[PDB]
């Protein structure tokens, strides 16, 4: 994000130590695995939206600049 | 999330893939960093809406198994 890059760092072995905790959860509760996926995929749609704000914070920022 | 753990293990590359080339677009446009550590944040915050689903998973869905 900017260069303490830490926090960010802290924020996905946050994510990194959750996502084994949950799968943990998973062999434990035996909930369906296909709820799981969904579980997943809006942690990645998260990243997807920080993929969209980075495609716009170098179009769009750097356009800032020019205009 | 499930044994997949490959599918937010890839997310979690394409965030620090991702936050790097934001810390790329600091170094180049020099915005303020008070809005790239908000930007920061709200990615934790979205890492923390985990980790209250995950706390609830625990306590509350195992109880669900239970009652």
Known sequence: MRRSEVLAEESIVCLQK???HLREIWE???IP???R???TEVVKKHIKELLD???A???SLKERLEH
């Open 53 to 55: 704000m980075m495609i």
């Open 57 to 59: 914070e170098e179009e």
């Open 18 to 20: 959750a996502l084994n």
């Open 37 to 39: 996926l969904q579980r």
């Open 33 to 35: 695995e296909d709820q």
């Open 28 to 30: 434990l509760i035996g």
